Amino acid sequence: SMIEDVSLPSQVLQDQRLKELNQQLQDQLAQQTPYQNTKPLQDFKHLVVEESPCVTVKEISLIPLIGQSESDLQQFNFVIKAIKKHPQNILGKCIGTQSLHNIVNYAQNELLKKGFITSQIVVSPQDLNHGNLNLSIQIGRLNKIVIQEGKISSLQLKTGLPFKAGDIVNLKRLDQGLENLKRVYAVDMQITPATAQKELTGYSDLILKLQALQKVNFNLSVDDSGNQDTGTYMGNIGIGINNPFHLNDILSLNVSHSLDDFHESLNRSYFISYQLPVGYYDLGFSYNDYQYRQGTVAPESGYPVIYHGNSQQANLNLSRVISRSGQHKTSVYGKLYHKESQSFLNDIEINVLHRKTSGWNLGVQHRQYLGNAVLDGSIDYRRGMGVSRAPLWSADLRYTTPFLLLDKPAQYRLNWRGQYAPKILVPNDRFYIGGRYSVRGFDGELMLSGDNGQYVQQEISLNAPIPNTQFYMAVDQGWVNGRNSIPGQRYLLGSVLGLRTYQNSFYLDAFTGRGLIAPDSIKKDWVTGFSINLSY
Ligand SMILES: CCCCCCCCOCCOCCOCCOCCO
């Protein structure tokens, strides 16, 4: 007997659409604007200079101020570490007033490097009488979080901000907490000195002005893509609920209906996503329900042959920011997933196509800023069971930058996704190319596939003379290789030209494309696509 999932095309397109949807929801979360706060005024190539009166330093130490425990100072030994590490070998040199000023400025830049923007390196110059350079730290702390405007529960502050009153002010934790609050608020954050009767000297007040974002958001989309003969028609209802349980949380709902004339299929899809932050951590869970019907409902033969089936997927996600700055953000994550799928023929179940799978994902993601350019990507390791240690490597890379093109503002965009499988994969685990999600300019009725694969999408958009409009041209490329692939059919090259416009909560995206290079079994026909969305 010949085993066959006649629905494999519709399920591949659903997975690609699911991945695109999850990326768009993650991209909706506002990040902190990039900056370069640790800006060296003077480069510190040479701190020691030849000076009129100087003292020979024989010890560089960090010395507690009044009321400072040495556990408080243990966190700041990197300041003295950096001093002693400097290739000018400060220890044993003759230090006058100008070099001492430079050594202090260097240790303060190092303080700002690690994010302590309200702390200050001071010198206790009395012990220089004995050749001892003794540094001290004015530890700047947080006195009060002040909500000048907007409502926020005490629990929201505790879970969204990884810091509390009385902690040491660090810009990495301020930015993290600010990003968590910007999921549900428009946020204004200011640092001011704390006042006592008329100041608290070592303390700061965090002034927050909050304005809640629209609680309920709707997105209705219709898409009509295909070739000049056949096409697919999609309808999407997206609902975004903002801060429903007052936990800086976001709940997303999506219902999709599709009519694919390429595979004479009808598809419905339900998707729910919940996400809440806990300081540097992030918790998420999602669920997808997918159903299809395939065949001719009223055939000429009088023998109706309908293939239909359902598929469910549940996911639990946990990620933690491990490193961040004004120009980068890095996090590690772990996923737990369970999948279940069954197929039918005229309401009779095909037993050998009943599939339950489960497994876990481990990965790391990074985002990097330089100027107005954004670079972000991830690498993922997956392992899943069946009914057997099937390892899958996944990777992602995206790059965006503005640039001038014939003296008009423009944007360049590159999307790259790659998959490497050491072992044989089942059909659904393969990497597919050709269609709106993998290589544009192809209709997707026939896709190339391999156990290993990668595509790179490239696109340039320029502003139209009309406001809130832009033209774009795109060139995409796909590659498949490894098992489940046959040579000579391993490459796709498509091109797309189109336009996009936004008219007062109405978004249009239309493109016409064609396949440039393809194996003989691929049509290289002309394709069109029209997308309309309404948010309110
Ligand atoms: C440590 C592994 C991280 C994940 C890497 C997966 C991306 C590797 O994809 C390889 C698939 O290549 C298919 C054919 O490639 C031909 C073109 O190659 C030129 C660019 O490498």
Author numbering: 1 to 197, 199 to 388, 412 to 560
From the paper:
CdiBAb and CdiBEc structures were built and refined to final resolutions of 2.4 Å and 2.6 Å, respectively. However, H1 is positioned very differently in CdiBAb and CdiBEc: the angle between H1 and the β-barrel is about 10° for CdiBAb, versus 25° for CdiBEc. In addition, H1 sits higher in the barrel pore in CdiBAb, positioning its N-terminus closer to the extracellular surface. In this orientation, H1 interacts with the inner barrel wall using 12 H-bonds and three salt bridges, with no interactions to loop 6, for a total buried surface area of 1263 Å2. In CdiBAb, the DxxG motif accounts for four residues on the 12-residue β1 strand, allowing β1 to form an extended β-sheet with β2, β3, and β16. As a result, the β-barrel is in a fully zipped conformation, stabilized by 10 H-bonds between strands β1 and β16. Extracellular loops 1–2 are short, with loop 2 curved inward and partially blocking the top of the channel. The equilibrium simulations demonstrate that CdiBAb interconverts between the two conformations, while CdiBEc stabilizes only the unfolded conformation.
CdiB proteins are members of the Omp85 superfamily.
